[PDB]
Amino acid sequence: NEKILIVDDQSGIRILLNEVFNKEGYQTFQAANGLQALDIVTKERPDLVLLDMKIPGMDGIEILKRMKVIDENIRVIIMTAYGELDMIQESKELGALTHFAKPFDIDEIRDAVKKYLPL
Ligand SMILES: [Mn+2]
């Protein structure tokens, strides 16, 4: 039973992604901000997190940090705006697997997670 947590403030996109990986066979979870995200990491200890780095009021790099502390075994793929070098460098230093810019290529994300989190 492999777990993926999808963190994104936009319901449309979040639900979209959740279904993509649910159809793939993964056990999925959803969060709209960092606090819920942190909550689920704690109670569910998901294997992989798709982290939207642009959520109002949320410091992306910080939630990454916290997630790593709560569970240093969790791997993360960050989702950015079509940009940011410092953010990427910081997430790389923290162990982030890779990053994808929005709007994203569904097939690309899909292939990426099956590669980093085979079923
Ligand atoms: Mn967002």
Curated annotation (Swiss-Prot):
<dbReference type="GO" id="GO:0030435">
    <property type="term" value="P:sporulation resulting in formation of a cellular spore"/>
</dbReference>
<keyword id="KW-0479">Metal-binding</keyword>
<keyword id="KW-0460">Magnesium</keyword>
<protein>
    <recommendedName>
        <fullName>Sporulation initiation phosphotransferase F</fullName>
        <ecNumber>2.7.-.-</ecNumber>
    </recommendedName>
</protein>
<dbReference type="GO" id="GO:0000160">
    <property type="term" value="P:phosphorelay signal transduction system"/>
</dbReference>
<feature type="binding site">
    <location>
        <position position="9"/>
    </location>
    <ligand>
        <name>Mg(2+)</name>
    </ligand>
</feature>
<feature type="binding site">
    <location>
        <position position="54"/>
    </location>
    <ligand>
        <name>Mg(2+)</name>
    </ligand>
</feature>
<keyword id="KW-0963">Cytoplasm</keyword>
<keyword id="KW-0749">Sporulation</keyword>
<keyword id="KW-0902">Two-component regulatory system</keyword>
<keyword id="KW-0418">Kinase</keyword>
<feature type="modified residue" description="4-aspartylphosphate">
    <location>
        <position position="52"/>
    </location>
</feature>
<feature type="domain" description="Response regulatory">
    <location>
        <begin position="3"/>
        <end position="117"/>
    </location>
</feature>
<feature type="binding site">
    <location>
        <position position="8"/>
    </location>
    <ligand>
        <name>Mg(2+)</name>
    </ligand>
</feature>
<feature type="binding site">
    <location>
        <position position="52"/>
    </location>
    <ligand>
        <name>Mg(2+)</name>
    </ligand>
</feature>
<comment type="function">
    <text>Key element in the phosphorelay regulating sporulation initiation. Phosphorylation of spo0B during sporulation initiation.</text>
</comment>
<dbReference type="InterPro" id="IPR001789">
    <property type="entry name" value="Sig_transdc_resp-reg_receiver"/>
</dbReference>
<dbReference type="InterPro" id="IPR011006">
    <property type="entry name" value="CheY-like_superfamily"/>
</dbReference>
<dbReference type="InterPro" id="IPR050595">
    <property type="entry name" value="Bact_response_regulator"/>
</dbReference>
<dbReference type="Pfam" id="PF00072">
    <property type="entry name" value="Response_reg"/>
</dbReference>
<keyword id="KW-0808">Transferase</keyword>
<dbReference type="GO" id="GO:0046872">
    <property type="term" value="F:metal ion binding"/>
</dbReference>
<dbReference type="GO" id="GO:0016301">
    <property type="term" value="F:kinase activity"/>
</dbReference>
<keyword id="KW-0597">Phosphoprotein</keyword>
<dbReference type="GO" id="GO:0005737">
    <property type="term" value="C:cytoplasm"/>
</dbReference>
